[model samples]
Target chain A: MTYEDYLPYSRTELLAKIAEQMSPKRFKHVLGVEKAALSLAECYGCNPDKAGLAALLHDYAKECPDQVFLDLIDKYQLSPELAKWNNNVWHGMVGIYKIQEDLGLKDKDILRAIEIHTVGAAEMTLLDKVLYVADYIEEGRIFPLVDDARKIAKLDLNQAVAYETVNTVAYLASKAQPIFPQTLDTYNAFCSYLKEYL
Target chain B: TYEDYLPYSRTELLAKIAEQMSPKRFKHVLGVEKAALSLAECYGCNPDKAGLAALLHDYAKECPDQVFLDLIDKYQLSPELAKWNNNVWHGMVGIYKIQEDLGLKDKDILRAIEIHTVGAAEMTLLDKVLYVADYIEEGRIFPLVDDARKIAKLDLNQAVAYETVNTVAYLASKAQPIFPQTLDTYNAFCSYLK
Candidate 1:
């Protein structure tokens, strides 16, 4: 597998594999997220295929056994600190390695979106923001204020990114979860970036 | 015939601090030292290190910005830190000055002085004691002083946790650019009590 193979032309093959690998419930959610991401890409002048592929593959290993991810950490030399975090973090941090190695996804933009989908960074590309927002506002989500996520996403992608970050940080805090520092850095950077427009 | 002013002696250090500081600054230092000793005793840290660190935490604060910048370049401190002015400098930049001018070489004591301002993600017991002591010292009158004082006595880690979360949120809520180290402090301690 190579980078070019993960392009839009091969999306159907990838989709078939994804459906086979994921549980029935998660497959539907990925399809919804891909649909939303493709539409967002069209709206925001991004490559729809790239967005769709990233969204589909974002959680390709989300349900993988803990041992598999633990093995990937040792195999790829991923950040050792990742071992300290819960599984909620692994699919993104370690998932990228599997996605790149097995799926042959080489585009940094697409790979980075999967890598940071769980914990956003201070600096995000437009595609990064789009996939992040799409994952949150995907049609199958029934969590509180998801409609608000959908509405704000259409209003402004950047604002939606800011909103999602704020919402996620607060949600984690409410759970008393140890927030990864990068999450706050993302919130601060995005909030400051948005301040001028307000 | 005369009282010994050894740096190791709390009584002598207190007298020397009073001699070096202005009447108002001297009073604040004394309050911090007094507060630090109690917290140190509570937390099982060396009272002498805590008291001395707290006493001289602001030793170089009275120095001018030019002096700080000069020291930064002179001692090869992080030039990035030079970007920050105001109180941030005194603790970070002040460490070099304290060591050079005052002959204090204890690394733990130096670090206690280094991080007294914003605190750090990995703080020693002395660090927390000095940080909480300075914030809740009798000379200080902040909105949360009473609550902080109460927590400082109840649980040392909780006290630091409370201070970090409260201060970081307040700063961020106001649209202020929280310094990275300060944010590091918040991330370090915020989840401890939770």
Candidate 2:
């Protein structure tokens, strides 16, 4: 049941590394995400080990300085358009590089789950859904509909994904904040699911 | 300054559109065309193109889902489009129907129709004219319609931005599925406001 069975590092080592990188409050959120991810994996019949590992490492680079992400983007030859986004976006889009180099985690599924944890993709795997919904509905989350989202997550993961996507875009648009376009793709991809389920 | 861009007379065009749309929708179409003509005049776009695009914008709005699916398949449009329903298909997929049924081939007119329901990142003057006219036409009576009409008279670009913001915000408030291009239009036009 340890993360070492799925990830390169043992559970203790991963948490130690994550704890060192994130603030106390952020690290606490990460643990809560792991709890949520494991529950979802058990409910949805996904690999509990992979879900736990991906959840633990999802926000590995959340606290990195903007310069660090900017340097990674440049070094990785990522799109220059990425430079325009702030840490809210970079921590997921550009954070995978730090996860790869520092943690030596090369599992594509885990890396992709981390990459899209902020802005979802049109096509998502179960692991991707697990981490995405878990990151949002973790026990520490105190948003208006966290309880509703949790209820949906326990019953249907796809509906939960649609629920979170709708609320996330709605929240961002309500504040006139910039919406990452891929989130719309996710919404469109799950439109049928939302209509059918919620 | 009507430029005779449409192949047929306006009367003939109205008859053709009336065949496809219900009377209520047809009235809205006529109002849009009228509003577009005025907007085109004030904004210096070709009134003929604006009027034609407005009249044809909803040409396929009421088509059964099969017609849009057939067009989507025939044109080899994006398969992802099949996931959406009439709300999106009526604009994105309806352009082909307009071209085939109405025999209107002006790219400006067609592009305006394609983008009228959901604005785009790059829009022509004709596109903005039809888009704003469709929102603030005579029959429209939303709370924002007056402000939209006033802005349409003053600045075409600002009107496009205002409509895009309000539309996207409204859709979000209802938790409705939003097309990605609509958000692209929002970003392209409203980024300056940020």
Candidate 3:
């Protein structure tokens, strides 16, 4: 059966199914993320169905992290433009490896969203934008003014997400976080497009 | 501060240089000067110093017909170096100007100014820096300058000298005019660690 039959299950069933491949703590985080993501899906006028599954599996391979990520990268021998600086940059690409290998989720849109959630490149697909915006607007996030962002996300998804991204970059830089260069690149692409609106 | 020689006013400097050199030689000097300044900025060098070297490089361009005969009286040019490469007398004249005119007498900097045309085998960092600076100064469209610019930008000393060897090797393939110092310089540089 697909995710429609699996989610919003009793806590016991939810715990058991997600733990088929994930640890206990990982399972709880996935459930918490699902709740936050489903709320975000409502805000951005996106399909709550796909966003639910994406949020559930976004960090499915956090346990494996960089080492396993490189094996898939080496096997693919991705182009230099995609693999320029560092591999740990976008964990989303690694998620596709698990999507295909472990979960057997072969839907191309699902897979593309998994691959590019972190490193959004030149021409992003709609699901790619949906997953990205949902992940940012996920309800668990609380900050100085995430409420204003939540309200705006519904009007124009790209504009709302791009605005939130400005805060995302500032948060990363102010916290002395290691800035992902591609995130800045995609942010620039979106900001260029949104110049007329904002 | 010889305001006339500063590279910003290329027209003024070109006119002043024209007083002493043939028009053709003066044009080549201006080209090399622009290239040096452009490449120096690209590689984070002192643009002023790089431009100065390019401007004064061919000072002895119009020296006496017998460069070797008047080499002693003209500049503090070494007779051995001039004898080693008969046509390399101009490089020494420029170095003399570096000393007497610019008040820049540091031996490494002087040698860098001196041997740009002739590759000094086992050249120092200053030598390699100036050599590569002159090579990519935007005027010359030599294909090797692309890689040479990259090497010179990434690493100042050893990589640049090695890049110089690559340039000489390519020039050799085309049967380009070369100096004895260049051949010896390339040979000596090949012995350097990768």
Candidate 4:
């Protein structure tokens, strides 16, 4: 029922660790995400404890200096291509290493959920979907379509993923910001769900 | 220039391309080459390479799906590519076929051919020439073609941005899945526009 069942630390201890590492604003956002993830997990029949833990730690490395992630990338011998991206990408793709090193949590599903929470994979597991959509539609978040995203999340999780992908890709294109290739993979994989709305 | 740049003579290359595609498709390639040459002259790109790349851009357009699938396997291309059809494969997978069959060894030409369909984050002068040429060639009758042609004359980068935005909007409106690089091209070029 609590993070203690899944994580090495108790729920309170985990919150303390997270609070210590993240800014107060970011910490608040993570708590909101955890709440959203738990509700979505219950709605979608995923393991609530896993969803809660994954959401809580999804941005574990978000506040780290860019060099910290760069060091991890070298220490782990990750792909050289990773160095080109900033924290927006590193916190998810490279953050898993720091999470494992610091938190001592080693669940593959939870780690994968963290790895892909930012730029989603083409094929995602239920926990991956829960953390991804929960992180986007958390109560603390404010965006053009946050309400619509929440409505879709409550209706069908997969459709929610599709809606977010379409909107995210469109937003990035409009701003002329560089898009991670996998983000497009996520859109292509899920855009079919938007056929009715399209 | 054609003889110095292309492995084959212009007449021979045109004949080879003509044989590979339908008459109508071949006509489109010819139109692309004409437009590409003009753009190259205007933009100071290598006209010979632009012409060659435009001529062979769709070299594999008419290839059967199995051909692309087999090439995807042969080259160890991404398995994700398998889900796409020739509309994507001709540029992504067709370059290899062009290399093997036509003995075309110019990297710029091959690179231009590869990205002519789905644009990339970074593109060279020749890439822009062929990309715009393919979109606004004389034969294209889309509602936006005239506007695209006018933009191409004033600024090639703007033309690239124009094509990417409209093309992406068109695909999204059709509820079609977009290739990642197409959006990559859109983001990369649109960033330069005011």
Candidate 2 local lDDT, B1-194, one digit each (tens): 22356567657777878999789999999899899999988889888788878888898999999999999999999998897789889999999988887677788888999988888999888988998999999999989888888877877887888888888877755667787788889878875434
Model 2 docking tier (incorrect/acceptable/medium/high): acceptable
Q: Which regions of candidate 1 deviate over 4 angstroms?
A: A1-29, A101-104, A139-163, A166-176, A181-191, A194-198, B1-30, B59-67, B83-87, B99-106, B138-147, B175-191
Evaluated with DockQ, which candidate comes out highest? Answer: 2
TM-score of 4: 0.77
The alpha-carbon RMSD values of the candidates against the true structure, listed in the order shown, are 4.7, 3.0, 18.0, 4.4
How many clashes (backbone N, Cα, C below 3 Å) per candidate? 0, 0, 3, 0
Residue A163 in model 2: lDDT: 84
TM-score against truth, every candidate: 0.77, 0.87, 0.47, 0.77
Q: Model 3, residue A16: displacement in angstroms?
A: 3.7
If ranked by DockQ, best first, what sequence of candidates would result?
A: 2, 4, 1, 3
Error of 3 at A150 (Å): 1.7
Off by over 4 Å in 2: A5-13, A79-81, B1-3, B70-83, B144-147, B169-177
* Residue-level lDDT for A152 in candidate 2: 89
**Over the stretch A1-198, how does candidate 2's per-residue lDDT look in tens digits?**
477755577668778989999899999999999999998998898888888888998899998999999999999999998898788889988999999999788788888999999889899999999999999999999978999899889888999998888778777766667877777888777766767764
Candidate 1 lDDT at B150 equals 87
Scored by lDDT, the top model is 4
**Residue B41 C-alpha lDDT in model 2:** 87
Off by over 4 Å in 3: A1-29, A40-46, A80-88, A171-181, A193-198, B1-47, B50-194
Task: Please provide, for model 3 over B102-137, each residue's C-alpha lDDT reduced to its tens digit, 9 standing for 90 to 100.
Answer: 455446556667887775766665466567666665
Instruction: Estimate the overall C-alpha local distance difference test score of candidate 2.
Output: 0.86
Q: In candidate 4, what are the lDDT values of residues A1-198, reduced to their tens digit?
A: 487866678878889999998899999999999999999998899999899999999988999999998999999999988897788889999999999999888889999999999889899999999999999999999988999999889888888888887777776666656677788788888888876555
In candidate 3, which residue pairs clash? B35-B137, B35-B138, B36-B137
